[PDB]
Design a protein around this nucleic acid. Structure first.
Ligand SMILES: Nc1nc2c(ncn2[C@H]2CC[C@@H](COP(=O)(O)OP(=O)(O)OP(=O)(O)O)O2)c(=O)[nH]1
Ligand SMILES: [Ca+2]
Length: 344
DNA sequence: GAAGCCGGCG
DNA sequence: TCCGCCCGGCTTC
């Protein structure tokens, strides 16, 4: 198992820098707004000059200006960032036996057969990938090379920005021993707080505690996952799937409960969603906003995926099922979501 | 099966 | 130390 994890450096801001080179070297902030009850905005991405002045993602925009008065504040343009992401993902495509797209800026590559099981050529490949993405798209990325997915990510994370993390087969055991508990994917701040207040600060501190004492705080799946990881037993493979969802939402001319009216609009959302997709989804979800604006949704999974034609029937049903769950209340806006896409 | 609560993520 | 046509795990009825 040779995994190369690729993560695009401050992606949205970096794209803005490429389109307008005048921002390069100046503090830049990409802003995301909301048209809900309040119209206020927040930080989506800050470049490193902004991050250096203390600007972080999710920071309310008002606050970011307090600490970065000198920064340039721009609106978010998803479609462009998506186009970039699309292009770069394709470049990676031809460098991997198997490729898993995790998000708009994160991919995992299995390169084991590519580099003939030789870990050194694997590192050489990562360097090539870095170099190519920079030359083709003028985007700098951070990569992580490791025997499994989770390590490959965890080391890239320690190597940002424009870095190249490497954990070799022989370094693994020590690395697990070395690892702080909160540094591990799946453990947010809240879980860490609770784990530290029970004597666990490092990954190897799990071994001494009994599985039941752990579960109580952890859950079920995480406990198991932690156990295997600490013992270096984790090795979930890289799959040919994209974790990025694609959806279309359409407003109705007026509020209704009538399927014959809603369907033509659902059918259109489905069409537009399937055009955005480059594979076969394994889940369809019908989302419906009611008069009082609250959300009602429901999906179905398909082991072997759903094709465009067969989605009309299923989506229709899901809609009826939503209308049987909420009787005597009209819809306003419908949408469909497609995820768990199988690639290639 | 499914509503709702909670931690985590992008 | 913030929001999501959020999203999955888990607990509960
Ligand atoms: N509201 C909010 N949005 C966030 C937050 N973190 C990320 N986002 C959204 C906006 C940008 C997008 C990508 O963020 P990422 O951290 O995945 O990636 P990045 O911007 O390249 O930075 P990095 O390389 O450090 O991960 O997801 C957050 O804490 N709050
Ligand atoms: Ca990134």
């Amino acid at each position: 198992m040779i995994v190369i994890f690729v993560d695009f450096d401050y992606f949205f801001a970096q794209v803005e820098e490429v389109l307008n080179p005048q921002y390069k070297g100046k503090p830049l902030v990409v802003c995301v707004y909301s048209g809900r009850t309040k119209t206020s905005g927040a930080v989506a991405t800050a470049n490193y000059e902004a991050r250096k002045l203390g600007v972080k993602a999710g920071m309310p925009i008002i606050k970011a200006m307090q600490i970065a008065p000198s920064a340039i504040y721009v609106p978010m343009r998803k479609p462009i960032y998506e186009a970039f992401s699309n292009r770069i993902m394709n470049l990676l495509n031809k460098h991997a036996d198997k490729i898993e797209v995790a998000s708009i800026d994160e991919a995992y590559l299995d390169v084991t057969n590519k580099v003939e099981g030789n870990f050194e050529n694997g590192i050489e490949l990562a360097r090539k990938i870095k170099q190519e993405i920079l030359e083709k798209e003028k985007i700098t990325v951070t990569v992580g090379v490791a025997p499994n997915k989770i390590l490959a990510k965890i080391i890239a994370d320690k190597s940002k920005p424009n870095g190249l993390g490497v954990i070799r087969p022989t370094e693994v055991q020590d690395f697990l021993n070395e690892l702080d508990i909160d540094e591990i994917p799946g453990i947010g701040s809240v879980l860490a707080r609770r784990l530290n207040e029970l004597g666990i600060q490092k990954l190897r501190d799990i071994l001494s505690k009994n599985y039941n004492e752990l579960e109580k705080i952890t859950g079920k799946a995480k406990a198991l996952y932690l156990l295997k990881l600490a013992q270096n037993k984790y090795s979930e493979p890289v799959e040919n799937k994209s974790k990025i969802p694609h959806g279309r939402y359409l407003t109705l001319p007026y509020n209704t409960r009538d399927v014959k009216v809603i369907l033509p609009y659902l059918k259109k959302a489905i069409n537009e969603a399937y055009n955005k997709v480059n594979g076969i989804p394994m889940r369809i979800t019908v989302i419906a906003i009611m008069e009082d604006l609250d959300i009602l949704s429901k999906g179905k999974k398909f082991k072997h995926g759903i094709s465009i034609d067969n989605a009309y029937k299923v989506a229709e049903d899901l809609l009826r099922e939503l209308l049987v769950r909420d009787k005597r209340r009209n819809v306003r806006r419908i949408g469909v979501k497609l995820d768990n896409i199988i690639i290639n």
